[PDB]
Design a protein around this motif. Structure first.
Motif, PDB file in Angstrom:
ATOM      1  N   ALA A  76      -0.622  -4.580   5.543  1.00 31.50           N
ATOM      2  CA  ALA A  76      -1.660  -3.753   6.136  1.00 31.50           C
ATOM      3  C   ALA A  76      -2.997  -4.472   6.043  1.00 31.50           C
ATOM      4  N   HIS A  77      -3.661  -4.641   7.182  1.00 33.61           N
ATOM      5  CA  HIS A  77      -4.844  -5.485   7.260  1.00 33.61           C
ATOM      6  C   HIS A  77      -6.164  -4.728   7.228  1.00 33.61           C
ATOM      7  N   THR A  78      -6.200  -3.462   7.642  1.00 36.63           N
ATOM      8  CA  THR A  78      -7.468  -2.771   7.824  1.00 36.63           C
ATOM      9  C   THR A  78      -7.667  -1.570   6.915  1.00 36.63           C
ATOM     10  N   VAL A  79      -6.695  -1.233   6.079  1.00 40.31           N
ATOM     11  CA  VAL A  79      -6.818  -0.080   5.195  1.00 40.31           C
ATOM     12  C   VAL A  79      -7.943  -0.340   4.201  1.00 40.31           C
ATOM     13  N   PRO A  80      -8.617   0.701   3.709  1.00 38.40           N
ATOM     14  CA  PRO A  80      -9.734   0.478   2.783  1.00 38.40           C
ATOM     15  C   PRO A  80      -9.311  -0.069   1.434  1.00 38.40           C
ATOM     16  N   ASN A  81      -8.058   0.130   1.030  1.00 36.92           N
ATOM     17  CA  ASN A  81      -7.519  -0.454  -0.188  1.00 36.92           C
ATOM     18  C   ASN A  81      -6.744  -1.734   0.090  1.00 36.92           C
ATOM     19  N   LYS A  82      -7.172  -2.484   1.102  1.00 34.20           N
ATOM     20  CA  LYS A  82      -6.463  -3.692   1.509  1.00 34.20           C
ATOM     21  C   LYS A  82      -6.334  -4.680   0.359  1.00 34.20           C
ATOM     22  N   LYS A  83      -7.435  -4.937  -0.344  1.00 32.35           N
ATOM     23  CA  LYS A  83      -7.424  -5.918  -1.420  1.00 32.35           C
ATOM     24  C   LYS A  83      -6.628  -5.460  -2.626  1.00 32.35           C
ATOM     25  N   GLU A  84      -6.444  -4.154  -2.798  1.00 34.11           N
ATOM     26  CA  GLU A  84      -5.564  -3.677  -3.852  1.00 34.11           C
ATOM     27  C   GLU A  84      -4.107  -3.912  -3.496  1.00 34.11           C
ATOM     28  N   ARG A  85      -3.783  -3.909  -2.204  1.00 32.43           N
ATOM     29  CA  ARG A  85      -2.435  -4.261  -1.779  1.00 32.43           C
ATOM     30  C   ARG A  85      -2.129  -5.725  -2.066  1.00 32.43           C
ATOM     31  N   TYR A  86      -3.080  -6.620  -1.791  1.00 37.32           N
ATOM     32  CA  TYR A  86      -2.857  -8.037  -2.054  1.00 37.32           C
ATOM     33  C   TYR A  86      -2.716  -8.319  -3.543  1.00 37.32           C
ATOM     34  N   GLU A  87      -3.458  -7.597  -4.380  1.00 38.26           N
ATOM     35  CA  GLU A  87      -3.348  -7.795  -5.820  1.00 38.26           C
ATOM     36  C   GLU A  87      -1.989  -7.358  -6.348  1.00 38.26           C
ATOM     37  N   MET A  88      -1.428  -6.291  -5.786  1.00 36.06           N
ATOM     38  CA  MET A  88      -0.100  -5.854  -6.194  1.00 36.06           C
ATOM     39  C   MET A  88       0.974  -6.821  -5.724  1.00 36.06           C
ATOM     40  N   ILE A  89       0.783  -7.431  -4.556  1.00 37.59           N
ATOM     41  CA  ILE A  89       1.701  -8.469  -4.104  1.00 37.59           C
ATOM     42  C   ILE A  89       1.630  -9.663  -5.042  1.00 37.59           C
ATOM     43  N   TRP A  90       0.418 -10.044  -5.436  1.00 39.87           N
ATOM     44  CA  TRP A  90       0.242 -11.166  -6.347  1.00 39.87           C
ATOM     45  C   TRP A  90       0.821 -10.854  -7.719  1.00 39.87           C
ATOM     46  N   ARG A  91       0.675  -9.611  -8.173  1.00 41.73           N
ATOM     47  CA  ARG A  91       1.260  -9.211  -9.444  1.00 41.73           C
ATOM     48  C   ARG A  91       2.781  -9.233  -9.381  1.00 41.73           C
TER      49      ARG A  91
END
Ligand SMILES: CCCCCCCCCCCCCCCCCC(=O)OC[C@H](COP(=O)([O-])OCC(O)COP(=O)([O-])OC[C@@H](COC(=O)CCCCCCCCCCCCCCCCC)OC(=O)CCCCCCCCCCCCCCCCC)OC(=O)CCCCCCCCCCCCCCCCC
Ligand SMILES: CCCCCCCCCCCCCCCCCC(=O)OC[C@H](COP(=O)([O-])OCC(O)COP(=O)([O-])OC[C@@H](COC(=O)CCCCCCCCCCCCCCCCC)OC(=O)CCCCCCCCCCCCCCCCC)OC(=O)CCCCCCCCCCCCCCCCC
Ligand SMILES: CCCCCCCCCCCCCCCCCC(=O)OC[C@H](COP(=O)([O-])OCC(O)COP(=O)([O-])OC[C@@H](COC(=O)CCCCCCCCCCCCCCCCC)OC(=O)CCCCCCCCCCCCCCCCC)OC(=O)CCCCCCCCCCCCCCCCC
Ligand SMILES: CCCCCCCCCCCCCCCCCC(=O)OC[C@H](COP(=O)([O-])OCC(O)COP(=O)([O-])OC[C@@H](COC(=O)CCCCCCCCCCCCCCCCC)OC(=O)CCCCCCCCCCCCCCCCC)OC(=O)CCCCCCCCCCCCCCCCC
Ligand SMILES: CCCCCCCCCCCCCCCCCC(=O)OC[C@H](COP(=O)([O-])OCC(O)COP(=O)([O-])OC[C@@H](COC(=O)CCCCCCCCCCCCCCCCC)OC(=O)CCCCCCCCCCCCCCCCC)OC(=O)CCCCCCCCCCCCCCCCC
Ligand SMILES: COC1=C(OC)C(=O)C(C/C=C(\C)CC/C=C(\C)CC/C=C(\C)CC/C=C(\C)CC/C=C(\C)CC/C=C(\C)CC/C=C(/C)CCC=C(C)C)=C(C)C1=O
Lengths: 70, 365, 17, 135, 53, 32, 161, 105, 49, 95, 67, 28
Positions: free
Chosen positions: K34-49
């Motif tokens: 998901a590219h435009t959601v307001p919690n976009k960067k929290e999604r990337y951090e969970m992927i990285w985790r």
């Protein structure tokens, strides 16, 4: 602000006195007309075309320096 | 003595929800006139545990603001009322600010105290400069495992009858039932003996709280109702990386849903980099979590708290002009243009600083 | 819980309730 | 008693001296409502709470009073049009900034330009064929 | 906020999880499914606050 | 003021880091 | 106080508006002067959401305007069929098919994840640099402990005699 | 010149503002920077550099502004057997032995 | 912001991935970099560049 | 039928934007290639498009900033939004 | 109830794939983002985790492994 | 154990000898 705007201000000096001094501080339709056409420095008076040239000139010039410096 | 001043009172059971007075500890700042901060501890947690945090010379929080470590209703020293409505509890703070002659204040909270602090901004936004929430989010937490454990501990604490049970019976009951070390220590310190050694009792109202948690309905402290609305002011959220209360995957979305001015992660929402540890909820115990929370708190109070919504920081106060909507001013002969919004003194209602500076201004002209 | 906040909820042109 | 004590106290409920001169939001928010946002119901609560404070929660005063539109939104479509003419690239840049934060691949961007310019090229050939039919 | 994203990613912002699980199923449940109209053994909830009679 | 010096000297011998808040609490604990 | 020098050298071909040397910083300033500053809206709703009915009219007006002008719109549709099929069947895998078929091709994702971590580091720049200075302030204070010992030597010598 | 009250802070820190409904939807993207002027502020690059030659060089510059400082600079650069101006004290040998040679009298 | 705008993230990391290939020791990257751009429009026809 | 609950991690539209865009334009071209007299339909639609939008502008949008607000439909939203809260707090009020 | 399992199967369709039965093939979320959601960067951090826990935060194992 | 509790709140490692000196300071 540029010299062309200053040249307008010298010519519009009598007009500036009629609108800003007389009409602007009145009430009613004459007051609304004077405050709307008040003479002075421009709000949002920037020229985007002039600014578009300055940007593209600086960006294209940095490319010239790389391509020519061989 | 001087910095630590906690007003002494006795909890009064009130039939009317409006005759509820809040008690707490006041921490005097380093400087003469500073804005005040009202901070709410976690539910059934001591206000004194946060004193070393707010009085740490390394953090130097008192250099910014005066701190009120205030207890909510049915907690600690404040009056008791069976209702836990966030609107009724929010009006308690407004009567406290009035009796204490506070015009507007910063609001802080930890855990459930973070919900309470944010609720006051939802119901009284004009009296609140900002909200700094620690390890909380305006979301329904009735089904989080961390809340279920707290809800289970309060239920087991209703079994103890202080009249019949001895002190050794209580100590054994707490060690066996409450497995969490921190919740165990907090609940022991809440036990206090009344005057004339009448009996022992919890400082918080255990009956009113248990019914709120055990009922597990809309008025529960774990729930966040739509009725609370939207907070329109400055809000900052900080929570551990692996927190049992705020899950980074989805528990940030409620912050955007409730807080209108939240920009997002990395600007108003941060996570403290840490390990998985069920005690990481108590950030003041660990220096690693406390250092990051204090620095982010100092940054909020110094540059973002009490700043107009459309301004970036406090640095733009007096040099950034905000656009104006047309036909918004009473003056008919008004030339509409950009303006810098007015910022007022933190206790302008109860002092005469505007009258005094008016006369000093006339002496110049 | 929740209570109706409008004090004029039961007002009609003919009287209260 | 303390609750009514602060409601009557003039110092507690009193506009600042400059409040009359300040820009005033003359709406409660019912003129333009956000319909599809996930916090839609929370917006309505704030509108209802704003209307209640104005009438001391005696909404009969609102029913009898005058209702006004949001006059601050007047002529807003004209003003955005003139700002687009003034600086079209600056208007388009900032109006699309948050959307352009998510940038598609080079392939997708190339397909957009390729199909757009191809449609414009065929449009020009259709115009030139209309001059052939006129001749 | 009023800026939640694109139209295609609109149903994404609704889910709120009570656990730390990843990835998260996006779908937010609207109602409880009621496949069979079964007569409930539960007593009626109308018998709530009726005075003595 | 005099009780502050008594506690501070005690904390001094144990080379324990002390803050004014701790001393104020200990002094309040003595009078309380 | 000695009289300082009047002025240093002034380069005859370097100015603030026309800097002699090139960098992306000066191009950034000329760029933001062109697009102008951030157009801050003072309203409570966005312009598009408040004029959805009106924007729908002008949107369809220009569609009809193009449709009324384009007499041969069917010829353009048919001339677009082959490139529409061709470019979509050719680029399907590299755009979307890779996400559930033979290879993922996560090159673009790796660059997002690296930027997300750099964004987080910039967000904690204050905390990281403050922890680095605390160690340097610890070393600096450790060297300043020697001057504090010598200042008391005069008091020790006075009481020793 | 006036200094005000040392106990008080600047008025910018004391002024505050509160929100209300309705609230502007717009979220600020960047801080405004209309004029490129940042005078009288030191560079933030000078953050965590270790001790080096610039420290003793700037020390002499500020010391030479005083009478006592001029005596220290001239004495150190002439009558101190050190192979570097970056003086680091890791032992009290030169300090203690300089005291025993003076406390005898 | 070079860390939030995906347009500069893609272009920056892509350019860095190409220039680091100078360690493969083909020749002066300052020489054949212009040839890469022209070659990218031969095989880039496959990707509609 | 029952609520079509998606078990996936992402919604179907955002995962197939490129594919749905193809089939979206395929049917546009399909209608465009089939409709040989599309210009006659565009011109035939001009008059009703102008007429109905100028006639209903005030009742839909113009009322929000001109003579009258016409808040009848808002009153129905505000009452229903309050009932939503009363139902959410049903257990509390009855208890 | 008695007829629940029969009726629920008759009313709606379930998923027949066992795609997630294989452990290492399970996605971390980097395939459909998901590219435009307001919690976009929290999604990337969970992927990285998720990627860091799979390799014990030695991401060289992910680079050498198959995606 | 009030002396033990305040020390515990500040996260200061306390020995048994320190607690006795503090208790004697209050009682004495
Ligand atoms: C007997 C002899 C004498 C005979 C006289 C005959 C004439 C009768 C005279 C009396 C008539 C007037 C009566 C009094 C009216 C009082 C009403 C009032 O209170 O004001 C309301 C209205 C309120 O406006 P507002 O509140 O400020 O803002 C509007 C909203 O906020 C919205 O603003 P927004 O930003 O959101 O934009 C949306 C807006 C505008 O946005 C639009 O989309 C419309 C765009 C229209 C212009 C563009 C058309 C396209 C073609 C040109 C392309 C332009 C491109 C430009 C860019 C270049 C290319 C990129 O939408 C509107 O439609 C607003 C129009 C005003 C509302 C009225 C109801 C309209 C609904 C029906 C709409 C359809 C008609 C629209 C007509 C044109 C509207 C301007 O004010 C007026 O409009 C004043 C009009 C009356 C002026 C009278 C002038 C003197 C009359 C005598 C002059 C001589 C005439 C000689 C005629 C000769 C015969 C041919
Ligand atoms: C006066 C002139 C009158 C005539 C002209 C009128 C023109 C009016 C249209 C103006 C432009 C369209 C409005 C766009 C709204 C704003 C932008 C936007 O979409 O927000 C982004 C938003 C999500 O994007 P994002 O948040 O940035 O995430 C992407 C990430 O950045 C990273 O990306 P990712 O990895 O997640 O996914 C890869 C990529 C997927 O790859 C793609 O982007 C697919 C498109 C590639 C290029 C396709 C060909 C280029 C089309 C324009 C050239 C004209 C062709 C000639 C037409 C001849 C026949 C008339 O995703 C995207 O980047 C966005 C795809 C979403 C679809 C884009 C919008 C529809 C296509 C453009 C409409 C074409 C209409 C122009 C002609 C109209 C003539 C009447 O998209 C949506 O709004 C969601 C809506 C649902 C979209 C999916 C289902 C679409 C079903 C309808 C398809 C319609 C196809 C029409 C074909 C034309 C006939 C052949
Ligand atoms: C020692 C090594 C050698 C040294 C290497 C040094 C290389 C220097 C690198 C410097 C990079 C360029 C720096 C400036 C550009 C940066 C800004 C930019 O626009 O980048 C794109 C930038 C980044 O793209 P991206 O979406 O992030 O994807 C990143 C990568 O592409 C990755 O995307 P992916 O993860 O999805 O990867 C999957 C890939 C999958 O691809 C494959 O698996 C295999 C591909 C096989 C191709 C088959 C060819 C078949 C040819 C058939 C032709 C038949 C007809 C011929 C007829 C001839 C006459 C008979 O599919 C693609 O993505 C293809 C991308 C397009 C490729 C076009 C060029 C292909 C050949 C390049 C040759 C270069 C030498 C390579 C030597 C090494 C060889 C081992 O895109 C943007 O969004 C920025 C704006 C783009 C606007 C679009 C229009 C711009 C037009 C002007 C562009 C600039 C001027 C031209 C420069 C070259 C551009 C092609
Ligand atoms: C003689 C008679 C004829 C003349 C009569 C006069 C008529 C004059 C007409 C002019 C009307 C007044 C002008 C007012 C401004 C323009 C209208 C507007 O909607 O702007 C507001 C809108 C933002 O307003 P806002 O609510 O205040 O922004 C809040 C947020 O910041 C926004 O971002 P956010 O993400 O934070 O918030 C959500 C955002 C979500 O929406 C988006 O953000 C859109 C995402 C797209 C960006 C993705 C990147 C793609 C664009 C990259 C750059 C391409 C251009 C540069 C490259 C080529 C260089 C030449 O906004 C929305 O909720 C929905 C937006 C509106 C619905 C979708 C719009 C589709 C049509 C408009 C675009 C037309 C494209 C070209 C087609 C025309 C053929 C040439 O601006 C835009 O979204 C971009 C448009 C910029 C203006 C360019 C077009 C001007 C003419 C448009 C006329 C109406 C459409 C006609 C064609 C319809 C085809 C279906
Ligand atoms: C021989 C070769 C030919 C045969 C080839 C066979 C292959 C044919 C290919 C067909 C593909 C079938 C598989 C997919 C079917 C559904 C497609 C879809 O987008 O579903 C995802 C989308 C959301 O799925 P999700 O991601 O799981 O999100 C779940 C949440 O509920 C989401 O709700 P949310 O609000 O929270 O989130 C936003 C939501 C926002 O979307 C919505 O909630 C509603 C959107 C408007 C719905 C349509 C309103 C139409 C009103 C009726 C007037 C026209 C009726 C047409 C027939 C009239 C007589 C001709 O949806 C989105 O996620 C983004 C929008 C994606 C585009 C969907 C709208 C595109 C228009 C589809 C209507 C097509 C018929 C009218 C087109 C023009 C006439 C040809 O579902 C829908 O939009 C349902 C709409 C009705 C579905 C059946 C419509 C007919 C088939 C649609 C084909 C679409 C492309 C071709 C037409 C495009 C023309 C521009
Ligand atoms: C030398 O190295 C190079 C650069 O430097 C680094 C570059 O920047 C560049 C990039 C180039 C650019 C960024 C410039 C791009 C410009 C482009 C594409 C076109 C520019 C077009 C315009 C600005 C439109 C101007 C419009 C007109 C001239 C028509 C209207 C004006 C009229 C009718 C005036 C009549 C003209 C005269 C009387 C001529 C007399 C001249 C005057 C200045 C008199 C002015 C008089 C008054 C009263 C103002 C290149 C290619 C380069 O090679």
């Amino acid at each position: 602000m540029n010299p062309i705007q200053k040249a307008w201000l010298k010519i519009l000096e009598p007009v500036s006195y009629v609108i800003n001094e007389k009409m602007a501080k009145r009430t009613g339709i004459i007051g609304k007309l004077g405050r709307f056409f008040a003479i002075g420095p421009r709000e949002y008076g920037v020229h985007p075309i002039n600014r578009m040239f300055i940007f593209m000139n600086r960006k294209y010039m940095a490319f010239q320096a790389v391509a020519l410096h061989r | 003595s001087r910095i630590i001043n906690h007003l002494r009172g006795d909890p009064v059971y009130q039939d009317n929800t409006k005759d509820v007075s809040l008690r707490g500890t006041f921490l005097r700042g380093k400087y003469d006139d500073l804005p005040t901060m009202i901070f709410f501890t976690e539910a059934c947690d001591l206000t004194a545990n946060w004193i070393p945090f707010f009085t740490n010379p390394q953090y130097d929080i008192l250099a910014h603001r005066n701190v009120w470590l205030l207890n909510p209703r049915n907690f600690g020293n404040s009056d008791r009322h069976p209702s836990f409505d966030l609107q009724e509890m929010s009006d308690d703070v407004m009567r406290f600010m009035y009796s204490q002659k506070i015009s507007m204040a910063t609001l802080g909270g930890h855990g459930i105290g973070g919900k309470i602090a944010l609720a006051v901004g939802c119901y009284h936004a004009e009296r609140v400069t900002g909200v700094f929430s620690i390890d909380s989010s305006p979301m329904d937490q009735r089904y989080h495992e961390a809340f279920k454990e707290f809800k289970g501990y309060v239920n087991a604490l209703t079994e103890i009858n202080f009249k019949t049970w001895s002190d050794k019976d209580v100590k054994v009951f707490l060690k066996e039932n409450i497995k969490d070390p921190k919740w165990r220590s907090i609940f022991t310190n809440n036990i206090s003996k009344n005057a004339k050694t009448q009996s022992d009792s919890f400082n918080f109202e255990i009956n009113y709280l248990n019914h709120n948690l055990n009922f597990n309905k809309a008025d529960s402290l774990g729930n966040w109702a739509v009725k609370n609305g939207i907070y329109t002011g400055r809000a900052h959220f900080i929570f551990p990386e692996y927190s049992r209360w705020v899950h980074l995957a989805t528990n940030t979305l409620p912050m955007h849903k409730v807080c209108a001015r939240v920009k997002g992660f990395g600007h108003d929402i941060f996570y403290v980099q840490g390990d998985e540890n069920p005690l990481n909820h108590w950030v003041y115990d660990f220096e690693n979590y406390a250092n990051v929370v204090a620095s982010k708190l100092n940054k909020f109070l110094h540059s973002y708290d009490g700043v107009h919504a459309l301004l970036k920081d406090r640095t733009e106060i007096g040099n950034f002009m905000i656009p104006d909507r047309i036909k918004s001013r009473n003056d008919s002969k008004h030339i509409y243009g950009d303006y810098s919004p007015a910022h007022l003194h933190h206790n302008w209602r109860f002092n005469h600083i505007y009258e005094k500076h008016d006369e000093l201004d006339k002496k110049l002209n | 819980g929740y209570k109706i906040r409008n004090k004029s909820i039961f007002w009609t042109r003919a009287g209260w309730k | 008693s303390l609750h009514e004590k602060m409601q009557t106290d003039y110092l507690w409920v009193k506009d600042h001296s400059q409040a009359d001169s300040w820009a005033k939001a003359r709406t409660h928010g019912y003129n333009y409502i956000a319909h599809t946002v996930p916090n839609k119901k929370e917006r309505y609560e704030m509108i209802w709470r704003s209307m209640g404070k104005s009438t001391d929660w005696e909404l009969e005063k609102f029913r009898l009073g005058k209702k006004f539109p949001d006059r601050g939104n007047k002529r807003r479509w004209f003003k955005n049009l003139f700002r687009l003419i003034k600086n079209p690239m600056g208007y388009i840049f900032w109006k699309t900034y948050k959307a352009r934060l998510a940038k598609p691949s080079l392939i997708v961007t190339s397909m957009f330009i390729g199909f757009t310019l191809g449609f414009i090229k065929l449009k020009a050939q259709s115009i030139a064929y209309s001059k052939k039919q006129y001749a | 906020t009023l800026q939640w994203g694109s139209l295609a990613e609109r149903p994404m912002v609704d889910r709120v999880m009570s656990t730390s699980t990843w990835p998260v199923p996006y779908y937010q449940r609207l109602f409880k499914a009621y496949p069979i109209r079964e007569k409930k053994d539960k007593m009626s909830l109308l018998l709530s606050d009726i005075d003595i009679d | 003021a005099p009780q502050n010096l008594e506690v501070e000297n005690i904390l001094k011998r144990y080379h324990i880091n002390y803050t004014q808040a701790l001393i104020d609490e200990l002094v309040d604990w003595k009078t309380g | 106080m000695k009289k300082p020098m009047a002025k240093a050298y002034e380069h005859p071909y370097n100015s603030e508006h026309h800097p002699l040397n090139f960098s992306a910083v000066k191009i950034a300033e000329t760029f933001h002067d062109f697009i102008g500053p951030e157009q801050v809206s003072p309203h409570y709703e966005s312009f598009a959401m408040s004029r959805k009915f009106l924007l729908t009219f002008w949107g369809g007006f220009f569609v009809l305007n193009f449709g009324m002008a384009t007499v041969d719109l069917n010829w353009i549709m048919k001339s677009t069929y082959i490139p529409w099929i061709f470019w979509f069947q050719l680029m399907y895998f590299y755009v979307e098919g890779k996400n559930s078929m033979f290879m993922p091709l996560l090159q673009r994702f790796y660059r997002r994840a690296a930027a997300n971590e750099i964004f987080t580091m910039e967000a904690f720049y204050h905390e990281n640099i403050e922890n680095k200075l605390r160690n340097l302030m610890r070393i600096t204070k450790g060297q300043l402990e020697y001057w504090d010992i010598h200042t008391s030597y005069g008091e020790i010598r006075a009481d020793s005699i | 010149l006036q200094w005000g009250s040392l106990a008080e802070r600047p008025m910018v820190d004391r002024v505050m503002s509160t929100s209300t409904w309705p609230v502007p939807y717009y979220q600020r993207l960047f801080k405004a920077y209309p004029i490129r002027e940042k005078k009288d502020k030191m560079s933030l690059l000078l953050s965590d550099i270790d001790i080096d030659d610039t420290n003793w060089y700037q020390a002499k510059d500020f010391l030479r502004g005083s009478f006592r400082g001029r005596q220290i600079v001239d004495y150190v650069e002439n009558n101190i057997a050190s192979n570097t101006y970056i003086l680091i004290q890791q032992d009290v040998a030169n300090m203690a032995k300089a005291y025993v040679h003076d406390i005898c009298g | 912001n070079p860390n939030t705008e995906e347009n500069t993230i893609d272009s920056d990391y892509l350019a860095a991935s190409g220039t680091v290939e100078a360690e493969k020791e083909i020749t002066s990257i300052d020489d054949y970099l212009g040839l890469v751009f022209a070659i990218a429009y031969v095989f880039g026809v496959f990707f509609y560049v």
